Amino acid sequence: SAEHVLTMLNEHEVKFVDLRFTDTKGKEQHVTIPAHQVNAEFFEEGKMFDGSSIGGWDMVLMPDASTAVIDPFFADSTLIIRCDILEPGTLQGYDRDPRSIAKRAEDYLRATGIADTVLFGPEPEFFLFDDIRFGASISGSHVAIDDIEGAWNSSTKYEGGNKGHRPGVKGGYFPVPPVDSAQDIRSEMCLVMEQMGLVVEAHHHEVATAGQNEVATRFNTMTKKADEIQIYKYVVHNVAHRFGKTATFMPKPMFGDNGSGMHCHMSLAKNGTNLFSGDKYAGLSEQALYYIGGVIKHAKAINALANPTTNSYKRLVPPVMLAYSARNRSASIRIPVVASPKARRIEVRFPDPAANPYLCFAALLMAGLDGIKNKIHPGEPMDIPQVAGSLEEALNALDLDREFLKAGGVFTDEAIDAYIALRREEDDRVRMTPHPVEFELYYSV
Amino acid sequence: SAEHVLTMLNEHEVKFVDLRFTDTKGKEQHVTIPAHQVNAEFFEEGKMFDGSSIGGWDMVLMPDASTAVIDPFFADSTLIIRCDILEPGTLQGYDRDPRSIAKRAEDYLRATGIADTVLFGPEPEFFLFDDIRFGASISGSHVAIDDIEGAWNSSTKYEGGNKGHRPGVKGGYFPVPPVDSAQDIRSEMCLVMEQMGLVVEAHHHEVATAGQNEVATRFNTMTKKADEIQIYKYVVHNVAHRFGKTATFMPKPMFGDNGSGMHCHMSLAKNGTNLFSGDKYAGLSEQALYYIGGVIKHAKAINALANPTTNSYKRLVPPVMLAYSARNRSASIRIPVVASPKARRIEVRFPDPAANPYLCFAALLMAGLDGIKNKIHPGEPMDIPQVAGSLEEALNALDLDREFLKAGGVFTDEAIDAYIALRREEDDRVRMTPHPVEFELYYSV
Amino acid sequence: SAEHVLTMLNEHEVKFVDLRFTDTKGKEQHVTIPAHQVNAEFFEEGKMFDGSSIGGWDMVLMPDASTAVIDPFFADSTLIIRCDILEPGTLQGYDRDPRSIAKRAEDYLRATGIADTVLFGPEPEFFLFDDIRFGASISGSHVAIDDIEGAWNSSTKYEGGNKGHRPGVKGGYFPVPPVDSAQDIRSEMCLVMEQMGLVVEAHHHEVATAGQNEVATRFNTMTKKADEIQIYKYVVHNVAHRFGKTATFMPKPMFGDNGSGMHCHMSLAKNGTNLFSGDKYAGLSEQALYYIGGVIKHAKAINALANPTTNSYKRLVPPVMLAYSARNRSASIRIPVVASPKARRIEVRFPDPAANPYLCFAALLMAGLDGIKNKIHPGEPMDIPQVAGSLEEALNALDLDREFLKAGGVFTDEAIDAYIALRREEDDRVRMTPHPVEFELYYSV
Numbered sequence A, B, C: 001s002a003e004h005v006l007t008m009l010n011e012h013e014v015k016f017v018d019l020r021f022t023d024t025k026g027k028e029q030h031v032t033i034p035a036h037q038v039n040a041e042f043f044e045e046g047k048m049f050d051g052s053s054i055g056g057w058d059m060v061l062m063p064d065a066s067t068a069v070i071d072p073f074f075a076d077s078t079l080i081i082r083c084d085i086l087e088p089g090t091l092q093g094y095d096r097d098p099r100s101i102a103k104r105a106e107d108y109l110r111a112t113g114i115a116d117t118v119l120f121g122p123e124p125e126f127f128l129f130d131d132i133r134f135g136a137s138i139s140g141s142h143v144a145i146d147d148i149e150g151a152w153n154s155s156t157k158y159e160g161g162n163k164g165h166r167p168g169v170k171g172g173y174f175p176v177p178p179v180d181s182a183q184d185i186r187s188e189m190c191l192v193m194e195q196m197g198l199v200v201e202a203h204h205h206e207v208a209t210a211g212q213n214e215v216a217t218r219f220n221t222m223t224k225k226a227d228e229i230q231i232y233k234y235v236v237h238n239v240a241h242r243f244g245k246t247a248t249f250m251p252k253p254m255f256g257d258n259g260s261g262m263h264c265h266m267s268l269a270k271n272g273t274n275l276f277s278g279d280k281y282a283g284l285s286e287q288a289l290y291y292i293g294g295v296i297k298h299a300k301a302i303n304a305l306a307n308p309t310t311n312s313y314k315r316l317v318p319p320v321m322l323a324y325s326a327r328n329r330s331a332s333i334r335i336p337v338v339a340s341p342k343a344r345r346i347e348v349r350f351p352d353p354a355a356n357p358y359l360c361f362a363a364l365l366m367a368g369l370d371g372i373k374n375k376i377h378p379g380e381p382m383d384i385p386q387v388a389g390s391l392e393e394a395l396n397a398l399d400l401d402r403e404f405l406k407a408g409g410v411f412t413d414e415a416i417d418a419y420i421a422l423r424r425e426e427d428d429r430v431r432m433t434p435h436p437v438e439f440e441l442y443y444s445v
């Protein structure tokens, strides 16, 4: 409540308030107010800003006082307050603001009476590098990745000495220190995440050499979880920074080793009971099977939002199979063997950390409901259709399979069209710029 | 009062008093007295100095005791006292001293009875660079800008490692840390500004890569606000310095990305009521519309004072349109959608931080009154005349449209003529020195 | 004749023929044919090329066999043949081709019967540097000039030793070797110019330090002289190159020392007699005085063609005075004291080597005839109006004073409009790019 935020201000000698919001691409934006400007009027009528220079968008920032967190990093005491972008005066909420769209998808779920709550559990992976250099110019282009754990540094001269304990290319999965360099950086990221209201469940090194890591975090309702992904990413980017590292959530930074994916575990619930539990395949309900059928039916349009970068598809090369299974981890829909009771859920393995968590989760939900809503029966478990093979494909597919997103006003046509416009500009730059292996392939033509 | 300054001296064990004033170009000058020379006589009869070596000008410094502030940066305890330049013995105030001219414009407003107070709200932007090198010699010339946030450093080797989170060229607008490097430098600038009597409203990163920033500050009456711009700039220049950065208020340091403008929000008030509020376009009064008409009528002469550098016009290339609107941000006169009550105001978007805040605000006011005074009706909102396309143009225009500035003794002819003389010397050096892209264009002629 | 070219081919074992032409900007273009493709058909029906990628323009290259010269530089025996750009099939000559325009101006002179021939004598100056570096990028810009004769190298360490005989800044005018480093380079340029059909009269070092030089060359009829300027420039650029130098015809490469101008001496003649000789001022005819009056009347439109670069105006800063005189070398129209008989002529001092010699000479002629044609009496000799103060000014002026160029079809409106379009793009790049002395002037604003 406003009341609560107003006490924290004194209770923490808060000097500043950081208004934050996410844009269409998924990047958290922010603007800072002195604490002495937070008073009744503020939580009532918001703060005006020029929405114009935000990519793909005067507007009003409406503080959601439920979201107040103290920032673990800024030097002066700052309270972060997440905001919604509202349409000014009229005060309804920009139909292009991803948080609004997530909230609308939750209310539409309620209005359909299929369940009261959607539960999401994203498993975001990241890379923790020491040095990243890249550039493109008329005369050429390059990218140079470096990290102390990079199997390639086995030959490197270091002046402290080389010490040689390092994860090999698919060998980052699980060896103790000193091979895993990041125990203290991951534990610290866990401690600061919980200080910002997240619940850590586990943290470990991932498969890739050169710093792949994962902090596993307890689930939430869709828009609350989407905001927890924006905090998750902020803490990873800044703790890494305090440690002299640089973190990145891009899907595929290195060829020849693991990519960073963000698997979404999903579940539906009506009056305190898990609709996805039942009889049917592996403890699932018929309700759950139609959810899978909706996801598989709309998978390529979902890819435009869940895999929104050209780089995303360097990861999705032959979890490409649109199939469910408790057995096949090749199938992009895994039914986790919970064994345990009614923590029954589906897991979609294909999305990645580059995805806008609001639009990605809204689109998984809307697809899943359209399955239920039309008895779109999934089929049989692989123990055969695939995800979009490229961003251009995914964008065409969202453009044509537009209907299930527009249900109940969740996503307007302008919203979908402006999104595709942004993602196309990006796809073009990558399409028209000559790639380094093309010189390898074709210079002596 | 003198009395008050005299207590602060003991109340702060003040070792020195810094007499400060602004020159015609707008640079704050200063001379330092030991606190033990501040006594009755001083606030009565001022301190004599050689005004002769000030660009464009024995004279007397008259301490304005209302302005006393403790300096947040000097090592020994110092009290800053702003001064007016008076004509000696006769004690009237140099008609070339920009502070005097601002004060005269305020009194003339009162004498016309159109209102009692003018309210100004400048939005100054700045750049925060790490390294700036430049030079001109017979054999050549150069400028080299560098900052850690410069999109161009994506390829750079750094020895700590490169870390790569950096604002792209028009992407400085709003991303959270680590992409925005300046959160702690801007918050600190806010805290020291308030310690010097300013009221911060917001601070944020601006659009440009390579360190564009903005600290938004609460309005004031014209001459008080002009002095707050001189403090604003001092704190930005010195906090940046403490942080190992270098700040600059020049309008256009980089081609191909955002320029730093200083938008002036203006409003008039008679007996506690806002004359700019009313019926008419977007909540405006007819009174306000004539103010806009006066600004547009005199815009090119105003440019000689509000855009006084050759570099200013590298920014003003096709907010060039002399038009008002609540909709068109292309129109140099924006009528802000306040929605709220009688915070109704006009916003002139074209001036820039290089402007002398006293002469710039005095000229906006005098133009705006001449509108009112002659019913110069603005026209219709663009939802078509332009600002001076160059300093030479702007200077010719001030020289010919001289009358509205001379009203009521605000600005003498000697004052206007000496000003144009200074700005011309500058324009010539830039006109006669061969430019680097001319070698690009014409060497192989 | 074709016949003659065909013998030279055998008479010189010519392996290739170089088709050359000049574009709107004034740069000589070329395309190369094997000698075995030169036969009847060629001199009859020309050779087709894609005129489209020539700046400001399928078309036909029509070889003018009167122009055949052997190239003194290419490794394999090559005969240069100058061409005209004709409109294809219809075969009339592009009204945008500068050579055509020059030829039209000569025929129009004949059709007016004012005289049979126009004689031009351009005095082009150049600089001969060792190293020229420059560049502009988002993060900065620069130009670096270097030459062994640069007064600035007096302090330089050279590893052969420094030797110190060098022209001071305005001291390049006339000292013997070793101070003048270029005696052998200029004599060689004279010998190769004559081998290409020019007649040298004198060669000497010019006023500037860092390599200003001049090869003085015997006059000719307008279009033949315009082609001799294209050969003049080719020989200077390539002999300099053989010598390890780099030559440039840009008007003002260095601030603080001499610029390179190209003064045009002009004269008119009817039936073997010089119309400019007579009674009147300094041996001039009344006919000649009206020529001067036409040049002065149209001087700013002539500047758009005779001074076509933004850099041109760094030279033309306060021969700016539009005045004739035998005494005042301050007056842009000098009446040379010939003393001798009927080598009476006028000299226009303001054009520069960057000018397209065809369009520059065509415009001087057309202005001069419009004087005669309308008795535009010049006035009295200075012993007061000036040239355009900038390219933008000059371009506006050509755009408005368009009529005298359109006389008799010499220059169409499309031709004039496309020209101004090219020169504007150039003026903009120079206008919008921040200049290095602006950082000197305005960084600490």
Ligand SMILES: Nc1ncnc2c1ncn2[C@@H]1O[C@H](COP(=O)(O)O)[C@@H](O)[C@H]1O
Pocket: A119, A120, A121, A122, A201, A216, A217, A218, A219, A265, A266, A267, A268, A336, A342, A343, A344, A345
């Ligand atoms: N009922 C549920 N619905 C949706 N997601 C869930 C549910 N229960 C757990 N999760 C998510 O799935 C994760 C389990 O990872 P794991 O149990 O190791 O496969 C939890 O951390 C939550 O993020």
Ligand SMILES: Nc1ncnc2c1ncn2[C@@H]1O[C@H](COP(=O)(O)O)[C@@H](O)[C@H]1O
Pocket: A048, B119, B120, B121, B122, B201, B216, B217, B218, B219, B265, B266, B267, B268, B336, B342, B343, B344, B345
């Ligand atoms: N009545 C007023 N007259 C003039 N300037 C004003 C007035 N009210 C506010 N301002 C200025 O305009 C700024 C508002 O910025 P924003 O409200 O974000 O467009 C304030 O910070 C003041 O600088």
Ligand SMILES: Nc1ncnc2c1ncn2[C@@H]1O[C@H](COP(=O)(O)O)[C@@H](O)[C@H]1O
Pocket: C119, C120, C121, C122, C201, C216, C217, C218, C219, C265, C266, C267, C268, C336, C342, C343, C344, C345
């Ligand atoms: N009758 C003429 N008409 C036009 N140009 C001439 C004429 N006679 C000489 N010239 C040119 O003027 C130059 C004379 O340079 P100077 O005699 O040293 O002033 C010659 O080299 C020709 O380029």
Ligand SMILES: [Mn+2]
Pocket: A123, A125, A206, A214
């Ligand atoms: Mn994982």
Ligand SMILES: [Mn+2]
Pocket: A123, A263, A347
């Ligand atoms: Mn999983």
Ligand SMILES: [Mn+2]
Pocket: B123, B125, B206, B214
């Ligand atoms: Mn701004």
Ligand SMILES: [Mn+2]
Pocket: B123, B263, B347
């Ligand atoms: Mn504004």
Ligand SMILES: [Mn+2]
Pocket: C123, C125, C206, C214
């Ligand atoms: Mn000369």
Ligand SMILES: [Mn+2]
Pocket: C123, C263, C347
């Ligand atoms: Mn001469």
